[PDB]
Write a protein that binds this ligand. Sequence first.
Ligand code: HEM
Ligand SMILES: O=S(=O)(Nc1ccc(Cc2ccncc2)cc1)c1ccccc1
Ligand SMILES: [Br-]
Ligand SMILES: [Br-]
Ligand SMILES: [Br-]
Ligand SMILES: [Cl-]
Ligand SMILES: [Cl-]
Length: 396
Amino acid sequence: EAPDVDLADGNFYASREARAAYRWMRANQPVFRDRNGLAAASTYQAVIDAERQPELFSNAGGIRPDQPALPMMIDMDDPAHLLRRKLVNAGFTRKRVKDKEASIAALCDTLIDAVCERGECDFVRDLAAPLPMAVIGDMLGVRPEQRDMFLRWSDDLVTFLSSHVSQEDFQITMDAFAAYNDFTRATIAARRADPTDDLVSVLVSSEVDGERLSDDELVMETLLILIGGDETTRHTLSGGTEQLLRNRDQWDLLQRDPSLLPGAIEEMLRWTAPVKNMCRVLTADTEFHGTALCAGEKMMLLFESANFDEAVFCEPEKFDVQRNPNSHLAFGFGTHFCLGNQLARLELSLMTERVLRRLPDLRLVADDSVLPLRPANFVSGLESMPVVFTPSPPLG
Ligand code: HEM
Ligand SMILES: O=S(=O)(Nc1ccc(Cc2ccncc2)cc1)c1ccccc1
Ligand SMILES: [Br-]
Ligand SMILES: [Br-]
Ligand SMILES: [Br-]
Ligand SMILES: [Cl-]
Ligand SMILES: [Cl-]
């Protein structure tokens, strides 16, 4: 019989038996209907086939199961989506992102300097969560001492996306958006008058097909970026490092061969899949990998389930930094493939290389089974990860 699960319930994703449920789905009903009838593509094949059919599986109903579309690229279909993405892409060209390497590395070393003399830290609180916020904060002009404020707003907003909020949490979300809107419109006005080299400046100057981003669009697209910058990467940093520490052979491999880091980052992404699902709305009735779907309903793409699909990944419950190929779907696939993927990979690489070399005997204090995952139906990962190491002096 099927697992009795609610794929819109954040408690499902905080369960370490979610992958057991996914396994049943992939073997018995690849396009699964949960206890409320919500449809979800669980196999790699079904996720890819849906991604490759955007006219049938649309983003224009919004990418959450019971929330409407907002006016940002991830809730748009081509051709409108393509224009918006080309405009925002000015901030994510390969050279611009790669040029951030020194500044990201300096943030990593500052963060490690803050804990390296202690011999213990909470890897989540002290390294994984602050780095992506500092990177995106610096892109958005956030003063270092205001990063925590933006982190709070981002947590509020991603909680809204990750549940069906009460009235008070709805109000908190709207308040956080109002504050973000105010800050960003102040930045836009300043940069339109006096451009710098930050993200709003680059986005204001972006022009495609004679078109430019309006103030309204700049607020919404930078919001999408902020909540990608500071609520996703953190979970791959923590969860991926956790697997290195749980499997000491993997830690040891990376420490003696830094050239294995690119493959290690890809396996951290496969394993952690911080984005647990994106929704698609059906534009027509269709028989999809054995399940009848109805026009107007939403289907989940279960990216973590796809990333553990034995049809594609041999021994998927084995964490193997050398996996080749490793064509995981943590960033999705197709027209909406994560625009920030290069920046996320760069953050992950730079922080992990420094953790390996500066905290070389890093160990978990407690085992995985007592480390909770955040209840959230959208983006999730570890709440806390106490680690110990031999102390060392800061770089400065
Ligand atoms: C490990 C970190 C991240 C993960 C796992 C992740 C995952 C994803 C996924 C699954 C999608 C949708 C793909 C689809 O439906 O096929 C997406 C889209 C997007 N991501 Fe990320 N993301 C991450 C980091 C980032 C960062 C750092 C940024 C910005 C700096 C960012 C910006 C975006 C944008 C703008 C889109 C929308 C693209 C479009 O609709 O065309 N993401 N991301
Ligand atoms: O900005 S949004 O209109 N929509 C939105 C925002 C973030 C994400 C999460 C995400 C982004 C990129 N890579 C991976 C994951 C998805 C969709 C919005 C934000 C907060 C609250 C409601 C809507
Ligand atoms: Br299938
Ligand atoms: Br659209
Ligand atoms: Br920037
Ligand atoms: Cl199509
Ligand atoms: Cl396995």
